[PDB]
Structure formats: C-alpha cells, structure tokens
C-alpha cells in the first residue's frame, strides 16, 4: 500500500506523525506492505518551492494509492496572492485528481455521549455519513456577478454530476446499513426535482438499498432531533456544506472529526481541523482526527475494513482512558497515541 | 382592533377558533375593542369562488389592521393547476400586501427546557428571532429551468430588497436586546458579498445595535452549540428556511411555532404547521402555534407587548399542565385552550 503523506503546516506534522506510528505498528504486526513518502504541501511547500502544490508533490500524489493529509494554512502566507495561497493548493489537489465526493462522518463513540450538545438518549448511536458533491453547484455556477445595484449566482447541476456522486453514496451505503437519504429542495426548485429524479434513476441499480428523499430545511431539523436513524446522506455542494457543519457538532468536539474526498483519482483523507499555529510544537495537539483519517484510508482506499474498525475501537478507548487536553484531559499527542497503541497490541 | 380572520383548510378552523377564544377573553377583560370577520381562503375559497384568494377576502385583508391566518392546503386540491392551488393564495396575499420580512421566533420557555433535544444547559435562555427575506432569492430567481441533461436556478438580490429587510431586523433588535447577526455566504458567493455590504451600510444608521456577520454553514453550528447568545438573525429566503426550521427543534417541536409576515400592507400572523387534513374535525389538534400567533399579533400589530407576554406565559403553563397528544398527553383542543384561558386571569 503506497501512501503519499502531505503533513502540511501547523499541528499538521504532529498529528500526521501520530497516525503514522499507528500505521507502522499495524504494518509490522501483520506485514501490510505499507510504503509511504512525505511531500511538501501548503505553507511548507511555498517556503521552498514558491507554490503550495509543486511538481514533486503532484507526481507523488499521482503514483500513490492514497493521500494522508495534515493541515494547511497559517498567517505567514495570508498575505500572498490568492493564486498561491495554501488553500489554493488544496483546491488544485482535488481538481488534479477529480475528487467529486466529500465524505464527512459524524458519530458519537459509546461512552462519549457526554460531550455531545444533545441529551444522552438522542446522541447515543449516532453514526451518520454525509456525502457532499464538491465540483458543482452555486459555488461554481455561471452566470454569476455583482453590480452596484444587484448580485446573482447560478445553482446549476448536470445529470453526470448528480449520477457520479449518487453512485458513491449507494456504494458506501451497501457496506454500511443500506440506507440512503437524498436531500434537496425539489418542492421549490428545478435543480431540486432534477436531483431527486436522477437519484431515483440511479437507485434502480441498488435494489438492496433503501432510498429516502428529504428537503434540506427538514433534514436540518431531523439531524438535531433524531440523528441516529440516518446512515448515508447524499446532497449537493452548498447543502452538503451546511449539513456537514451541522453534523460535526453532534460528537461534541472538532478534534475527533476525519474526512475523505473520493473521485476519479487518488483518494485524499484528512482531519477536518485547521492548522492551529499557536499550539503547534507544544505537543498538546489531539491526533484523533488524523488517526481516524488513517482508519478511513484503510477501509476506503485499501478495503481493510476489519483493521479500520480496530483502530476506531482503540481510539474510542484512548479517549475514555487518557483524554487529550481539549477533552478536559492532560494527555499530549505522544502519550495519547501510546494509549491507542496499547489497545492496538 | 380590526382583525381579518382566514381559518383556511384542515385544522386551520379549529386552531384559529382556539386563538379567537383567547382574544375574546382578553377583549372582555381589558376592553380592547376587538372586531373581526372571517373570510374564505385556500381550498375553502376554491370550493366557493374557484380561487384561493378571492376579491371579498382581498378587500377584507386590506381593510383590517392585521390578519389571523390558520392553515392552508389539502389533498383535495393538490391536482389543481398551480395558478389556483391553495398554496398560491399565500403568494398572492403576501404579494398583495407587500410583505417581505418573515418573523420566526424560537424561544425556550423557562421550565420547558426538558422538552428540548439539547442538553438543558444549552437550551436554557434561548430567545432568538430569525427574520427571513420573503420576496426574492433563488425561490423566485430568473432564469430557471431544467432539461434532460441539466437544471438551473438563480440566486439574485437587489439593493432595495436587502435594505428593507435589514432595516426591519435592526428595528426589531432595538426593541429587543440590541444585537443582530446577518447570515450570508460572502466567502464564496457574490450575493453573499453584496448582502453583507448592504446590511453593513444599513447598520450605520443604527449605532446602538451591535451587528455581527456569519456564514450560513457556521450559524448552523452556532445555533446548536450556543443558541442562547443570539438575538435577531437576519438572512435571505432559503437560508432563512433552513435556519428557522433548525431553530424550531430547540424549543422542542416545529408544530408549536408562530410566525408574522411584515411589510408595507396588513401584517399576517400564522402557524408554521400544516393543515393536517386527516386529523381535522376530531379535536386533538394542538392550537399552541395559533394562540402564539395571536400573541405575536398583539405585540407587533398593536403594540400590546405585556399582553403578548401574558398569553405566552399562559400557554407555557398549559403545555406543562395539560400537554396535548402531539406532546404525549391527552388534553385535546378544547381542554388545552381551557387551561390557557384558566391562566389568562
């Protein structure tokens, strides 16, 4: 398994290393044939190449079977031209590989319901996966513009865009609880009814999967009062953006959330948190998100579902045994990773 | 006070009658000089005039100082052409009276925290008022349409559209807790930028009202983590729908919420719930939203703030003491209203 590791900036390198210790342990114990290489990316790449996603890193991503990304960004490069901002390198990574689906998992690990903003009974059992369309929608819609008197943006979707992301959602559901909810605003918009209609056409190919439709505004309600009854949620770009952010508050902590972007090329896995520059180096950065993204990678890029579950259980135990400082604990990056490893042995 | 009552379809007549008993009681007690007439609307009007918003009703709403609307809609008319569907009657009513601001309050009444899906510590003290733009946005944006290969819709906003609503929001805040949060998507959309820019400018005329800007996807998180810090939230059409439905779960149930549509003409007050056709004429229907709508009317159309607070307290007590079926109780329409009236003394 060839992995390209793009540590990034800030706490990026710390957390990425924590996850690597976990992977190397698993590799040694079972001989997974792991082969990884680290490449400069984001602010780090700017500082030595003039751009956030240089050719060596680009070719590295290509050759690899998966990308493990850390964090990117930091005030040091906030004054550069948009063209070479650290965030732009992230856009180029996705576009280069044609990553159209963004996987945003949200689950409350048994024992941690106390963290959630929701009352214990509601939180218990949450394990929802939100699949957001990345390349299309109002974010990239034409025509768009602004004048002195008015502004306009176009929410547009073609059939191929809806189909490709719908398939990913169905595939994922097959491996999970065979339940899919397609979110739209079909009762008011033409794009809504186009989405719904296309998703149902795709669903015909998955007789084993239970399909449900919902309106974005209604879905927002349901995710808060009954998130446990959902498995896979598929939706468009701006809608998926709001829903993913909303789902992320259910576990009760930012440092616990991983993510993935699947598309035509090399799949990318990265923690949802930013680079937290001021805490970088301090050794107190929670590596949970980065470790869980490694799990997501094993499962999704390498099909090692059985291993992903183990890493996931160990982390759960670690959070309960030696919780990091952001979780009201005193276990720094290293000591926390040690506890995970202890439960992995 | 001249009130035009438009009960509508399904449970509309039942819930509206409940609201009227409360109004009549306050009238007898405080000598308010209430006067009102009920007019055909929605399906009820279709079955007698062929159209949802007939002339006699138009003239009725244009002569009253406020409208008390019930529910609209029913399977009996779903097939009819859009031009005369009961739902179109609403569009015409809003359009005829130039209503552009939709007021949706989410308030957690003291002692009712237990009902919320959120941990009591976070639901305690919530009193947010979302002010949503009604007339424009992607809902009515042009061009729009679909084909076999794609579909499109347009999010467009003009300066006057944004200024009207922003102004209302600031005026509300002044009579509230002097804080406004304008929600947009300025970091990605031209419309977001145009929106932020215009409200920002309008905020200058209100030096005492604290303005804050948030992206819609971030507010979605904020409303779940720390809803108690918000006062007035101003935003566009679709963002307003999503956000207002989201905040609905905070107090407990969506069916318990009232709303007001303000503009240049006669202000309209109506329950956010549906007509619930199948449960019509059986009692059981929770009139809480209808009564709260009447409370909003007293406050916004007539300025009787303390009286509005008085009836809000009464229903709060009633929900605790004689909870309706939809809240796991037995008190039907007449029973619940009785309790409410019992506390009106």
Curated annotation (Swiss-Prot), chains A, B:
Catalytic activity: (2R,3S)-3-isopropylmalate + NAD(+) = 4-methyl-2-oxopentanoate + CO2 + NADH
InterPro entries reported for this sequence: IsoCit/isopropylmalate_DH_CS, IsoPropMal-DH-like_dom, Isopropylmalate_DH
Quaternary structure and partners: Homodimer.
Residues at which substrate binds: 94, 104, 132, 217
Cofactor(s) this protein requires: Mg(2+); Mn(2+)
Binding residue positions for NAD(+): 74-87, 274-286
Residues at the site labelled Important for catalysis: 139, 185
Native source organism of the sequence: Thermus thermophilus (strain ATCC 27634 / DSM 579 / HB8)
Keywords noted in UniProt: Amino-acid biosynthesis, Branched-chain amino acid biosynthesis, Cytoplasm, Leucine biosynthesis, Magnesium, Manganese, Metal-binding, NAD, Oxidoreductase
Pfam families found in the cross-reference section: Iso_dh (PF00180)
Compartments, as annotated in UniProt: Cytoplasm
GO cellular component: cytosol
Binding site for Mg(2+): 217, 241, 245
UniProt cofactor note: Binds 1 Mg(2+) or Mn(2+) ion per subunit.
EC annotation from Swiss-Prot or TrEMBL: 1.1.1.85
SMART domains linked: Iso_dh
Pathway linked to the protein: Amino-acid biosynthesis; L-leucine biosynthesis; L-leucine from 3-methyl-2-oxobutanoate: step 3/4
Biological processes annotated in GO: L-leucine biosynthetic process
Family that this chain belongs to: Belongs to the isocitrate and isopropylmalate dehydrogenases family. LeuB type 1 subfamily.
Protein name as catalogued: 3-isopropylmalate dehydrogenase
Function per UniProt: Catalyzes the oxidation of 3-carboxy-2-hydroxy-4-methylpentanoate (3-isopropylmalate) to 3-carboxy-4-methyl-2-oxopentanoate. The product decarboxylates to 4-methyl-2 oxopentanoate.
């Amino acid at each position: 398994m060839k992995v390209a590791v793009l540590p990034g900036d800030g706490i990026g390198p710390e957390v990425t290393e924590a996850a690597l210790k976990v992977l190397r342990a698993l590799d040694e114990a079972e001989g997974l044939g792991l082969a990884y290489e680290v490449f400069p990316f984001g602010g780090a790449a700017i500082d030595a190449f003039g751009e956030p996603f240089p050719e060596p890193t680009r070719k590295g991503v290509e050759e690899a079977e998966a990308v493990l990304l850390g964090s990117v960004g930091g005030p040091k490069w906030d004054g550069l031209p948009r063209k070479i901002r650290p965030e732009t390198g992230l856009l180029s990574l996705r576009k280069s590989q044609d990553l159209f689906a963004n996987l945003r998992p949200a689950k409350v690990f048994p024992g941690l319901e106390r963290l959630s903003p929701l009352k214990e009974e509601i939180a218990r059992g949450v394990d929802v996966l939100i699949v957001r369309e990345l390349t299309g929608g109002i974010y990239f819609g034409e025509p768009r513009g602004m004048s002195e008197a008015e502004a306009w943006n176009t929410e547009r979707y073609s059939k191929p865009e809806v189909e490709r992301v719908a398939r990913v959602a169905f595939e994922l559901a097959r491996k999970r609880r065979k339940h899919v909810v397609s979110v739209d605003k079909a009762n008011v918009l033409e794009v809504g009814e186009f989405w719904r209609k296309t998703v149902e056409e795709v669903g015909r190919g998955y007789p084993d999967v239970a399909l449900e439709h919902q309106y974005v505004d209604a879905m927002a309600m349901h995710l808060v009062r009954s998130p446990a009854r959902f498995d896979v949620v598929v939706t468009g770009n701006i809608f998926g953006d709001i829903l993913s952010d909303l789902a992320s508050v259910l576990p009760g902590s930012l440092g616990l959330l991983p993510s993935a972007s699947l598309g035509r090329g090399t799949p990318v896995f990265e923690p949802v948190h930013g680079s937290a520059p001021d805490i970088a180096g301090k050794g107190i950065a929670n590596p949970t998100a980065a470790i869980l993204s490694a799990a997501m990678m094993l499962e999704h890029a390498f099909g090692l579902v059985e291993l992903a579950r183990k890493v996931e259980d160990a982390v759960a135990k670690a959070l309960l045994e030696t919780p990091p400082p952001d979780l009201g604990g005193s276990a720094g990056t290293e000591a926390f990773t040690a506890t995970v490893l202890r439960h992995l042995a």
